[PDB]
Design a binder for this molecule. Structure first.
Ligand SMILES: OC[C@H]1O[C@@H](O[C@H]2[C@H](O)[C@@H](O)[C@H](O)O[C@@H]2CO)[C@H](O)[C@@H](O)[C@H]1O
Lengths: 148, 148
């Protein structure tokens, strides 16, 4: 399982893309997108995500460092194609190991849906897609944000 | 949401029945049943349940005081009629208020299934059943345990 802590999160199909909250904006319904790294070595606070775990399970919340918005599915509408956005309230996610070491799926608990990135263009929105075991557009890797 | 802590858990249709781990047995796959209170004022450790919450959500685990077994759906088989059992691996549950003051449903997240007690017969097993708006055999209330 991924240990609790603060991370950058990169896509496996598109290795030059991080999970990013548009414009560092705290408003409801601000889009979550794929984007190039925006500061060396670990980004500004809109590309750093704090993971909190329910012990002895694979269930987590995800919250940005600055501003302090959670990851949520828009309008709590748990269907194929729905948008990911920033909000004052989270959607709980299940972070599940895949076939290769160090690759994870970010899944909706108990439903056949997962976070996916459909293109390499900068600022493409992240959306839900059907589970597909080997599709690298819905697999992700974690890099720690290390402080002193 | 219900405050974290240690509780007895009584059915709303059948107020003489507590959630109980059969025989205080530590084995994997031991049945969870409805049963009369087994000690004054708050039972032994097989009738006392500790609730741990994921912050800013309604998702919890449930663990008995002695032996220290979690609540699990048998073989992780999330369908109508499946058995509830004791195990070292928990199933995450969503605990949601029902309005009359102090009453709740104990649901499987994102599915229309909930813990149900089918009869008042002593030692009847607890199973999954479908959610509705009116039946009292899928509603539960809580008594705090005073450790001292
Ligand atoms: O059978 C449910 C009931 O078991 C009690 O424990 C019994 C056990 O079943 C029996 O095999 C034995 O030899 O004596 C034990 C003590 O009477 C539990 O105490 C009760 O809470 C239920 O779980």
């Amino acid at each position: 399982s991924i240990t609790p802590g603060t991370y950058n999160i990169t896509n496996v199909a598109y290795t030059n893309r991080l999970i990013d909250l548009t414009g560092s904006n705290p408003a409801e319904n601000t889009l979550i997108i794929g984007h190039h790294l925006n500061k060396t070595p670990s980004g500004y606070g809109n590309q750093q995500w704090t993971l909190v775990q329910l012990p002895h399970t694979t269930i987590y919340t995800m919250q940005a460092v600055n501003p302090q918005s959670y990851v949520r599915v828009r309008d709590d509408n748990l269907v194929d194609g729905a948008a990911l956005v920033g909000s004052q309230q989270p959607t709980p996610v299940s972070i599940e190991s895949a076939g290769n070491s160090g690759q994870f799926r970010i899944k909706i608990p108990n439903l056949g849906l997962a976070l996916t990135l459909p293109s390499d263009a900068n600022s493409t929105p992240i959306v839900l897609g059907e589970v597909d075991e080997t599709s690298t557009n819905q697999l992700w890797a974690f890099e720690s944000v290390s402080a002193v």
